[PDB]
Ligand binder design. Sequence first.
Ligand SMILES: Nc1ncnc2c1ncn2[C@@H]1O[C@@H]2COP(=O)(O)O[C@H]3[C@@H](O)[C@H](n4cnc5c(N)ncnc54)O[C@@H]3COP(=O)(O)O[C@H]2[C@H]1O
Lengths: 72, 72
Amino acid sequence: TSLYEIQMLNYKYENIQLRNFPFGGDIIFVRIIRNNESIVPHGDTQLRYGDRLIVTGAKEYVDELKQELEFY
Amino acid sequence: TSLYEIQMLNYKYENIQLRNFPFGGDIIFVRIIRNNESIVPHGDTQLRYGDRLIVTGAKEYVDELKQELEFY
Ligand SMILES: Nc1ncnc2c1ncn2[C@@H]1O[C@@H]2COP(=O)(O)O[C@H]3[C@@H](O)[C@H](n4cnc5c(N)ncnc54)O[C@@H]3COP(=O)(O)O[C@H]2[C@H]1O
């Protein structure tokens, strides 16, 4: 697996832009699936509750992000 | 999510960082395979001859980039 899906269910990250984001080891956001649309994420893209995040990275770092964003 | 491989075979774009690349369309480089290693691209990553760029985005622009980078 090189593409992982994380659900953004953490209120503390609502409206945060990717350009400010706390990247673990390092990850790329491949797509954000939001309200029937798949968006190509860039610096000014903001997270929203319920986003389906498609990410790529080493599993260790993906795991941290999954924990923080989906499991809190 | 579709990913496409683009060989960086055009010396003209050699050494250009992603932060300066003249993107003409909606795209993200998801990975770059270089020296048999899969790396996670950022602003400071420089294009190198022979890079295998794994990209996602508008197919229209993927085609244009392919023209620019591996037809040249
Ligand atoms: N995988 C990739 N494919 C194509 N181009 C790439 C790229 N990774 C970086 N870049 C290009 O470099 C800028 C610089 O990147 P950086 O990593 O330094 O600085 C970034 C970054 O940490 C954050 N960001 C934007 N998109 C991101 C994404 N998909 N994943 C994670 N962070 C992202 O916003 C900062 C400013 O974003 P902005 O897009 O407005 O500005 C971008 C974009 O034009």
